[PDB]
């Protein structure tokens, strides 16, 4: 169903009708406090009125890297980067070469960014150890040093680790998976990458670049108190202007994208950083917004006796209608689901004035200016949407 | 020199000095720094929505820009980096194609990509440019001397068949400015078009730099592809590829409201000003023979390449490539030139080989104080 945008503001779009949506993807991540926030958004106007890029050392460069290691238990010196996939490229190849070592572990569902080594089929993926390239046009040995497992299978991963432990450069991991539904770790599923990884030599990577400033302060590491050995980050780091970075401790350090680090991106990331540290409550606050979220929809779905599956973590969330007939990875999520009737609610709930993205493995992400009756809107939205499919 | 502001040529330095900046952050700013209708227009879209992730009404205009502006582009997809732009032309060419090499030449940079990023003896050799790439990252790219047309007609005649691209900063603008030999970039277009594969021109550089269409326009030679980037979003992170439509056949920042605002803005105003590139012509011009006045007086050898106000300064100890040019060059002492000029309140990179990037802030009485500068350095050397 067509929407181009016009504006937003707070959690609304306007389209080109001038229509008025409630907004639940919120542009995929980075907006905790809602779209045209006029704190983040007055700091790096006024950078672009002073210098937005130079490409010389500035003095927020300190700032953006102080808050960033402040928040984050396991950052302690960064490298900035234009993008998420930059900073996992430049992240695998500072695991790559620090072991000297070749070998890359993901897991399947688990998106990286589109740089040549990590990009896999996900969802359009057969089994979870087949290594599928994600694009056409890739060369043929993309993958080659890139091996894959099935999320929260511990089993698979101590085999795996039993065999090649002494190849294995890096294990890169979304934490919480949250670009393929919204699946947590299994308990003691992130401990045991970080003992098997730790006992092998092999480097731990987490990629934030969702749950970074999001699932908690300090990410999921603080959240699961798992520290990784390097972080990537992005997405709520910089509020929506694009940024990103990958760091760690001293240690894991010891070892160039023009726009990388410019700095219009580095004020960004001192405003929203700098806001964030200010809130004190804010994530008591996120995580009250997401329960009303969640509790609200599965009422409205229990309510018209549709089958749902309901995952959550903070403002990050999955909503999937079920067929008429706890899933630990993507393929026990996706085959619960009834895809048509979910992009024919999509479609419903658009009409309603509620915009979600169609695929049900696509998040929510709520912000703060999801409030109660902007949640109790959504909830009238949801029953008038049912109720017509 | 750590930066405290910039506005037009100048920075501020922590100490409050002030700075004449020549290098003008390698690329972006034909219209100088703090440039106040694209500065307005960004932050205008920060008001109203910086990313949705939806369609846009500014997606159309973007694109109408580009496709009006750049001969050779019909239909074009953003990216949010040039390296990320590149890797996606790449990728379309070895699809569409359904071969592998890539061809590249020696010196030119095309961004940190697995598949194309060199070290910048021999100019056929190909060495990773990162620690930490994989084995097989460039073992389908061949590298070639940059306007070496016997080598070039060499490779095509034995691979042609199997080359689904070949590369190229039409300009080589990262390596000292070396223009192309004439007709290289003809032989290229000849070769490329006979063999079946696909020519890619990366003008992240080039790009409503050296002409309001770029190379392409200025030596009259369309590629199959384009890569655009730096000015074209006036210095917001924002890149595209494209083509015609024949050819034509995402980073989640990539496309983004802001980014495209930046190119509304800037592309609506280079569009207005059609004798732009004639004053710029003009600055490069008078700053060239400025600089080589100069140099001349304290009888100091220097090469000096220009296209545009594209231009690369270089003391020394015509050539057509990076090893000819590096061999002429006194690395040491021009950078003890750049120390001097510095404290003299003007900032070039130390090294020889980055270019100068000229703007419209860059007038007439900046570069007569540049020319008292480089004087004063010059006698301090
Ligand atoms: C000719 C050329 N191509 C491609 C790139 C890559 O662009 P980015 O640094 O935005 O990835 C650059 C960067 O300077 C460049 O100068
Ligand atoms: C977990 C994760 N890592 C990496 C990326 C890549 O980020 P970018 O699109 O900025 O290259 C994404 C993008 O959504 C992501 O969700």
Redesign the interface.
């Given at each position: 169903l067509?929407?181009?945008?016009?504006?937003?503001?707070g959690c609304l779009?306007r389209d080109?009708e001038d229509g008025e949506i409630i907004?639940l993807?919120?542009?995929?991540?980075?907006?905790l406090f809602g779209?045209?926030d006029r704190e983040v958004?007055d700091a790096?106007?006024d950078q672009?009125?002073?210098?937005?890029?130079?490409?010389?050392?500035?003095?927020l460069d300190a700032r953006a890297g102080a808050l960033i290691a402040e928040l984050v238990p396991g950052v302690e010196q960064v490298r900035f980067a234009?993008?998420?996939?930059?900073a996992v490229?430049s992240a695998?190849?500072?695991?790559?070469?620090?072991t000297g070592r070749?070998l890359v572990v993901t897991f399947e569902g688990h998106y990286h960014?589109?740089?040549?080594?990590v990009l896999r089929a996900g969802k359009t993926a057969t089994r979870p150890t087949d290594v599928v390239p994600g694009?056409?046009?890739?060369?043929?040995?993309?993958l080659?040093?890139t091996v894959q497992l099935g999320w929260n299978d511990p089993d698979a991963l101590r085999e795996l680790f039993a065999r090649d432990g002494d190849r294995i450069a890096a294990v890169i991991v979304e934490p919480v998976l949250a670009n393929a539904g919204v699946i947590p770790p299994a308990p003691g599923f992130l401990q045991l990458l970080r003992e098997l990884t730790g006992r092998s030599g092999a480097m731990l990577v987490f990629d934030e670049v969702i749950t970074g400033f999001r699932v908690a302060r300090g990410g999921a590491q603080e959240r699961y108190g798992v520290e990784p050995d390097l972080t990537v980050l992005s997405?709520v780091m910089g509020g929506?202007?694009?940024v990103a970075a990958f760091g760690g401790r001293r240690h894991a350090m010891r070892?160039?994208?023009?726009?990388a680090g410019?700095?219009?991106?580095l004020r960004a990331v001192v405003a929203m950083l700098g806001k964030i540290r200010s809130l004190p409550d804010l994530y008591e606050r996120l995580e009250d917004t997401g329960q009303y979220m969640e509790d609200t929809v599965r009422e409205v779905f229990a309510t018209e006796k549709r089958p749902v599956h309901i995952n959550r973590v903070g403002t990050l969330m999955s909503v999937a209608l079920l067929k008429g007939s706890e899933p630990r990875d993507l393929r026990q999520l996706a085959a619960l689901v009834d895809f048509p009737r979910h992009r024919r609610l999509q479609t419903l709930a658009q009409k309603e004035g509620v915009?979600f993205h169609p695929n049900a493995l696509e998040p929510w992400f709520l912000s703060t200016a999801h409030t109660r009756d902007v949640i109790d809107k959504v909830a009238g939205a949801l029953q008038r949407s049912l109720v017509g499919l």
């Open positions: 067509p929407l181009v945008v016009r504006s937003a503001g779009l080109v907004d993807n919120m542009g995929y991540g980075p907006h779209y045209a958004l790096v106007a672009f009125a002073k210098g937005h890029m130079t490409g010389l050392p500035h003095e234009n993008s998420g996939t930059e490229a695998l190849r500072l695991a790559r070469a620090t070749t960014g589109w740089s040549e080594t694009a056409l046009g890739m060369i043929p040995e993309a080659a040093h997405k929506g202007f694009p070892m160039a994208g023009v726009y410019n700095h219009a991106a915009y």
